């Protein structure tokens, strides 16, 4: 079985950073210091 | 009361564009994450079903 | 001559026991949760407790870890999208 509901709520599969547009990772990269964003996602395991 | 930040007007605005994106969205899970369930027992009870 | 008695005891806790094939702490997802919807089926369940005398009712508080998460989507101005999901029970 590979059900997909898992993968839709970002339950299994991929980590936050990939399956993100690569602005949106390139933006975060580029502010982290002052104003963070790394915890609005799941990237689980 | 709140709160608000000093952004840049344009910057704010890309930032927000990019983030209707359907690809983009918002997940969250509680931290302790299980479901509750309690049940009774009668005084000088011992075993429990 | 004396008799001797032992206790232990240990408040601010919970008893815990986890799903695993080994109940080593391996990953948020367990193999056991993989392996039985790989054992793919519908079951039911029986738990048994024994406990010590207590002077007036009580309660047995129960908790069952699953996973319970939620989505947001805007699409335009003033618009929240959302939907929720937890595994086991809905």
Same mark, same amino acid.
């Given at each position: ?45 | ?19 209707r ?29 | 001559? =004396? ?8 408040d ?7 799903? #695993? =094939? @080994?109940?080593? =702490?391996?990953? %948020?997802?367990?193999?056991?949760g993989? @392996?039985?919807?790989? %054992?793919n #089926?519908?079951? %039911?369940?029986?738990?048994?407790? +024994?406990?010590?005398?207590?002077? +007036? ?7 069952? +870890? ?14 929240? +999208? ?7 029970? #809905?």
């Amino acid at each position: 079985s590979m059900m997909p509901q898992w993968s839709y709520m970002h339950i299994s599969g991929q980590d936050a950073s990939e399956y993100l547009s690569p602005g949106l990772v390139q933006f975060a990269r580029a502010t982290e210091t002052y104003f963070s964003l790394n915890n609005k996602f799941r990237n689980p395991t | 009361y709140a709160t608000f930040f000093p952004m840049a007007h344009n910057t704010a605005s890309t930032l927000e564009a990019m983030l209707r994106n359907d690809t983009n969205d918002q997940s969250f899970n509680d931290y302790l994450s299980a479901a509750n369930m309690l049940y009774p027992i009668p005084a000088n009870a011992t075993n429990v079903p | 001559d =004396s008799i001797t008695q032992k206790k232990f005891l240990c408040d601010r806790t919970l008893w815990r026991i986890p799903f #695993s =094939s @080994n109940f080593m =702490s391996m990953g %948020a997802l367990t193999d056991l949760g993989q @392996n039985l919807l790989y %054992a793919n #089926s519908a079951h %039911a369940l029986d738990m048994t407790f +024994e406990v010590d005398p207590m002077d +007036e009712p009580t309660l047995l508080y129960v908790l069952f +870890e699953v996973f319970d998460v939620v989505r947001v989507h805007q699409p335009h101005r003033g618009v929240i +999208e959302t939907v929720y999901l937890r595994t086991p029970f #809905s």
